[PDB]
Design an enzyme around this catalytic site. Structure first.
Site, PDB file in Angstrom:
ATOM      1  N   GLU A  35      18.027  18.296  95.956  1.00  0.00           N
ATOM      2  CA  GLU A  35      19.143  19.201  96.189  1.00  0.00           C
ATOM      3  C   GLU A  35      18.614  20.560  96.663  1.00  0.00           C
ATOM      4  O   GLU A  35      18.981  21.027  97.737  1.00  0.00           O
ATOM      5  CB  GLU A  35      19.996  19.361  94.925  1.00  0.00           C
ATOM      6  CG  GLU A  35      20.812  18.125  94.537  1.00  0.00           C
ATOM      7  CD  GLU A  35      22.020  17.855  95.430  1.00  0.00           C
ATOM      8  OE1 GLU A  35      22.333  18.682  96.309  1.00  0.00           O
ATOM      9  OE2 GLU A  35      22.670  16.803  95.256  1.00  0.00           O
ATOM     10  N   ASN A  46      28.849  23.578 103.854  1.00  0.00           N
ATOM     11  CA  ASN A  46      29.284  22.238 104.173  1.00  0.00           C
ATOM     12  C   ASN A  46      30.294  22.281 105.313  1.00  0.00           C
ATOM     13  O   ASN A  46      30.754  23.364 105.691  1.00  0.00           O
ATOM     14  CB  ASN A  46      29.857  21.591 102.924  1.00  0.00           C
ATOM     15  CG  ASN A  46      28.881  21.623 101.770  1.00  0.00           C
ATOM     16  OD1 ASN A  46      29.240  22.004 100.660  1.00  0.00           O
ATOM     17  ND2 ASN A  46      27.627  21.250 102.037  1.00  0.00           N
ATOM     18  N   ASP A  48      33.350  21.130 105.318  1.00  0.00           N
ATOM     19  CA  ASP A  48      34.644  21.515 104.755  1.00  0.00           C
ATOM     20  C   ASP A  48      34.759  23.009 104.376  1.00  0.00           C
ATOM     21  O   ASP A  48      35.660  23.381 103.630  1.00  0.00           O
ATOM     22  CB  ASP A  48      34.960  20.645 103.525  1.00  0.00           C
ATOM     23  CG  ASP A  48      34.173  21.059 102.296  1.00  0.00           C
ATOM     24  OD1 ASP A  48      33.192  21.801 102.464  1.00  0.00           O
ATOM     25  OD2 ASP A  48      34.535  20.664 101.170  1.00  0.00           O
ATOM     26  N   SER A  50      33.335  24.814 102.240  1.00  0.00           N
ATOM     27  CA  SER A  50      32.761  25.131 100.938  1.00  0.00           C
ATOM     28  C   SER A  50      31.255  25.320 101.059  1.00  0.00           C
ATOM     29  O   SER A  50      30.648  25.004 102.088  1.00  0.00           O
ATOM     30  CB  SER A  50      33.067  24.033  99.919  1.00  0.00           C
ATOM     31  OG  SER A  50      32.397  22.836 100.235  1.00  0.00           O
ATOM     32  N   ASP A  52      27.428  25.058  98.779  1.00  0.00           N
ATOM     33  CA  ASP A  52      26.665  24.616  97.627  1.00  0.00           C
ATOM     34  C   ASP A  52      25.773  25.776  97.232  1.00  0.00           C
ATOM     35  O   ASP A  52      25.360  26.546  98.092  1.00  0.00           O
ATOM     36  CB  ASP A  52      25.829  23.388  97.979  1.00  0.00           C
ATOM     37  CG  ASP A  52      26.656  22.288  98.609  1.00  0.00           C
ATOM     38  OD1 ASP A  52      27.773  22.047  98.121  1.00  0.00           O
ATOM     39  OD2 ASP A  52      26.199  21.671  99.602  1.00  0.00           O
ATOM     40  N   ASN A  59      28.998  22.999  94.108  1.00  0.00           N
ATOM     41  CA  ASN A  59      29.923  23.241  95.222  1.00  0.00           C
ATOM     42  C   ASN A  59      31.097  24.158  94.879  1.00  0.00           C
ATOM     43  O   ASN A  59      31.578  24.161  93.748  1.00  0.00           O
ATOM     44  CB  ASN A  59      30.450  21.903  95.741  1.00  0.00           C
ATOM     45  CG  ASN A  59      31.247  22.047  97.022  1.00  0.00           C
ATOM     46  OD1 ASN A  59      32.442  21.801  97.042  1.00  0.00           O
ATOM     47  ND2 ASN A  59      30.587  22.465  98.095  1.00  0.00           N
ATOM     48  N   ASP A 101      32.876  14.890  84.263  1.00  0.00           N
ATOM     49  CA  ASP A 101      34.151  14.723  84.975  1.00  0.00           C
ATOM     50  C   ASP A 101      34.588  13.265  85.185  1.00  0.00           C
ATOM     51  O   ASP A 101      35.776  13.002  85.423  1.00  0.00           O
ATOM     52  CB  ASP A 101      34.108  15.438  86.330  1.00  0.00           C
ATOM     53  CG  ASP A 101      35.480  15.943  86.768  1.00  0.00           C
ATOM     54  OD1 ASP A 101      36.067  16.792  86.053  1.00  0.00           O
ATOM     55  OD2 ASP A 101      35.965  15.500  87.831  1.00  0.00           O
TER      56      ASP A 101
END
Length: 129
Positions: A35, A46, A48, A50, A52, A59, A101
């Site tokens: 990562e 990213n 979209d 967003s 990281d 994110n 989650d």
């Protein structure tokens, strides 16, 4: 800050990440490597919109606030900036949440792709803990 492998392993352990939700320390350290390459100030934008952040590349769509992610949420109740700290407490606090989650560490694509199934013990091999 860039963490040394065994340095992060220990920091993670100190912070309760060893076997949290059944994920041995090896998994966590491995997750971090790909990562972020152990670098706490890592970011990545990213498609979209967003972003990281941090050692675990957390994110902005869901988990932290950076004020530029239309329609996002701040699940871990932190500015994304905290995730870039040399002290990893917030990166861990939120990771402890992300992993709870429902899908486990699969939430980290790099984990699913590069750590899952592999001899992950190798990442804590010969460290003092």
């Amino acid at each position: 800050k860039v963490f040394g492998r065994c340095e992060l392993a220990a920091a993670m352990k100190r912070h309760g990440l060893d076997n949290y939700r059944g994920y041995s320390l090896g998994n966590w350290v491995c997750a971090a490597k790909f990562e972020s390459n152990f670098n706490t100030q890592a970011t990545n934008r990213n498609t979209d919109g967003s972003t990281d952040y941090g050692i675990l590349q957390i994110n902005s769509r869901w988990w932290c606030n950076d004020g530029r992610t239309p329609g996002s949420r701040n699940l871990c109740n932190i500015p994304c900036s905290a995730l870039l700290s040399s002290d990893i407490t917030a990166s861990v606090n939120c990771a402890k949440k992300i992993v709870s989650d429902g899908n486990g560490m699969n939430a980290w694509v790099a984990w699913r792709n590069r750590c899952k199934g592999t001899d992950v013990q190798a990442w804590i091999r010969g460290c003092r803990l």
